[PDB]
């Protein structure tokens, strides 16, 4: 029972491909030839954060756009105040090398993970004042790439074993186990309706999963390098993926095909982080050319250049209200652009 | 500008001073990345340098300098994505089982992929040919001609001091420099050879930070 299943899979792939090429009525790149873009965006760093020691690898925002959590490679979760430029929280991690950190939607819990294969969930509203270890989600056989909080009791995680998981804070065991991918997942991104989430693997495979059952709905295999970044649209209908080919690809969930292709000739480096704005107009991406790019989601042209950092841009994130954008590189410097 | 704002600024300054105190001891130590396949003697070198989780850190101080050795415990054989977290480290100790000739080609391929990595162009890879006693026993008492045809035309150098595997490794290394060394499963020299290499490696950093090289 090998050749028949292979030929059936090939026939289904051909069917999906012809359906996608038939549903391609008109690309957005040629339709947006009439809308007037904003032009040239010049962002200036309002406040600077020069307290980190090792390479900053991840960051996230909470409910209010004032607290900014960030993770460093020396096992440090530093939560800064974006307005007053002060250090709010400092959490010494037992695992030095980390790659992910998130903030609960209520502003009470934080997450961390990495090469330790154990996701540590810390609580900030403890009566002991200091930050203590609250939850230790273990059971994976791969490095933790990204993690995002769905609510005050559940959290989705992506491991290096090509499998994503959904853990429950109350239980602490494998609550939802999704089907394994071909490549290892590198990033995660949740939807505003906390029902669906799209994740890109190490190979050219971006799969959409639900929060109730472990079944995949859409799979995008259109790429040419390793995807390292992903983000969700504020409306929950599109998502942009960044890979090592310096060209971002914006797909949608309503048609299951490629909509926008952000590409340029003078950029051959990799992509680390991708994040949308509040309205979804200015798409901010982090390239390995010591600079950050801000493209237009409809024009797909050069709109904003951020040459403030001096090392490889590692992570970036826009607040829930789009008031400011945080960016962290390997120079242990957090910059808050506006 | 109120009293609570001043207290928050004072707490931020205290956290900054704590981070600087941590950085002070963080700069005074070195960080090494231990890599190797399953056939290598990585566990032997771990249990020799004593003077669930996909990472394991070993803290040992010799010659008044600490070395934090990070080794993958429960991770896959792929080292393409999680390798970027080991940048700006002191050295990458790559262990190779030179005794088994059947699994030596994959070891050479892994060494070539690590040396020619995208982000490891500024990190020095130190070779450790483990199981020297078994390597000597398999020669004085498996043939290399059955695996490497270039062994018949290669002989021992006359200008050396009493080399095929080392030559095959330095051919890819020279094409940061490598440091091939020979050690056994009971030899306690691994605690010193590192100090014999890093003292030079960091020296090269002193030639790059001070703009001397």
């Amino acid at each position, epitope marked *: 029972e090998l050749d028949q299943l292979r030929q059936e899979a090939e026939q289904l792939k051909n069917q999906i491909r012809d359906a996608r090429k038939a549903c391609a009525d008109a690309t957005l790149s040629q339709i947006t030839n009439n809308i007037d873009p904003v032009g040239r965006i010049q962002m200036r760093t309002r406040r600077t954060l020069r307290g980190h020691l090792a390479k900053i690898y991840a960051m996230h925002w909470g409910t209010d756009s004032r607290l900014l959590v960030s993770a460093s490679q020396d096992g440090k979760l530093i939560i800064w105040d974006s307005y007053t430029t002060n250090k*709010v929280h400092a959490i010494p991690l037992r695992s030095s090398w980390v790659m992910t950190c998130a903030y609960a939607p209520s502003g009470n819990y934080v997450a961390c993970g990495g090469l330790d294969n154990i996701c540590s969930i810390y609580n900030l509203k403890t009566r*002991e004042g200091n930050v203590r270890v609250s939850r230790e989600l273990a059971g994976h056989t791969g490095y933790l790439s990204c993690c995002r909080f769905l609510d005050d009791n559940q959290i989705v995680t992506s491991s290096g074993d090509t499998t994503c998981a959904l853990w429950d804070i109350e239980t602490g065991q494998q609550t939802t186990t999704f089907t394994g991918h071909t490549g290892d997942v590198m990033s995660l991104s949740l939807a505003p309706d906390t029902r669906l989430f799209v994740s890109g693997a190490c190979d050219a495979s971006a799969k959409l999963w639900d929060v109730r059952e472990g079944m995949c709905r859409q799979t995008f295999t259109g790429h040419e390098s390793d995807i390292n970044a992903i983000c969700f649209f504020p409306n929950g209908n599109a998502f942009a993926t960044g890979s090592d080919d310096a060209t971002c690809r914006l797909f949608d969930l309503r048609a299951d095909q490629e909509l926008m292709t952000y590409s340029h000739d003078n950029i051959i480096c990799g992509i680390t982080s991708v994040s949308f704005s509040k309205s979804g107009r200015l798409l901010l991406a982090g390239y390995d050319d010591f600079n950050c790019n801000v493209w237009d989601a409809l024009k797909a042209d050069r709109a904003g250049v951020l040459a403030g950092h001096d090392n490889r841009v590692s992570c970036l994130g826009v607040t829930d209200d789009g008031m400011a954008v945080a960016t962290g590189s390997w120079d242990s410097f957090l910059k808050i652009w506006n | 500008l109120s009293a609570e704002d001043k207290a928050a600024v004072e707490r931020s300054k205290m956290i900054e001073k704590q981070l600087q105190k941590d950085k002070q001891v963080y700069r005074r130590t070195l960080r090494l990345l231990l890599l190797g396949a399953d056939n290598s003697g990585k566990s032997t070198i771990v249990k020799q340098m004593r003077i669930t989780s996909g990472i394991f850190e070993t803290k040992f101080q010799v010659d008044k300098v600490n070395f934090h050795m990070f080794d993958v415990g429960a991770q896959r054989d792929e080292r393409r994505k999680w390798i970027q977290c080991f940048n700006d480290v002191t050295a990458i100790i790559f262990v190779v089982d030179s005794s088994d000739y059947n699994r030596l080609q994959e070891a050479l391929n892994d060494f070539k992929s690590i040396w020619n990595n995208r982000w490891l162009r500024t990190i020095s890879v130190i070779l450790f040919l483990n199981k020297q006693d078994l390597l000597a026993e398999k020669v004085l008492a498996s043939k290399i001609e059955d695996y490497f045809p270039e062994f018949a035309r290669y002989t021992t150098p006359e200008d050396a001091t009493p080399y095929f595997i080392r030559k095959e490794f330095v051919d890819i290394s020279t094409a940061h420099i490598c440091y091939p060394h020979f050690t056994c499963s009971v030899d306690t020299e691994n605690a010193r050879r590192i100090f014999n290499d890093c003292k030079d490696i960091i020296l090269q950093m002193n030639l790059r930070e001070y703009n001397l090289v």
Partner: single-chain antibody
Amino acid sequence: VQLVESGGGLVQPGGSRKLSCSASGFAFSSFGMHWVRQAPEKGLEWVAYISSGSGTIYYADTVKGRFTISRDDPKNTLFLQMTSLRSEDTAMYYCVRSIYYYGSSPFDFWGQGTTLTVSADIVMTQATSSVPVTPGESVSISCRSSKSLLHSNGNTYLYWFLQRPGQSPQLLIYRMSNLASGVPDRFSGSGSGTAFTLTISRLEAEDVGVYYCMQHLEYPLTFGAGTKLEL
């Protein structure tokens, strides 16, 4: 979370008294500590404040320089030395913990307090001091300050403390409207930068006591006259 105070009793004026406070349940080195006195049949009165690591130490305008306060982190202890006591220092002293950051609840937990017997600042003028109301109905306690507490940062400093007979005061709302922890949602705060109001939807048997108001705009911490609810 527990604060054990010791060093109370009777003393003669002119001597010296060293009160001790031991913390058990949290890291004492990362908590700002406030010593606050309360006279019998009177209101609260802040005495001294110390930050983490003994960086900034502030005293009240009436006891500035005469009293001293120190802390020991390796043993989690707080010492308060008072010399040349007058006829007013005979009161009940309490130790309060508070961390200062965005989202924190300062003055959340109060110590047990000890009694000691002997032998400009933004004052809080409470227009209401005795509002008898049966439990189960909504009550409104109003207060007025001599200066606008609404700082330019956007945070209004308005702390409420409910002191029950025989129990230390407990924090209800630390900001103008941000409810604290360990307190039911029945308490709500509102008003402008000058006149503040605390509304309770329903009262219970354990919802009796004096309601003190405290401002934290400047370093001189002054309390109100005290508004208690009778039955």
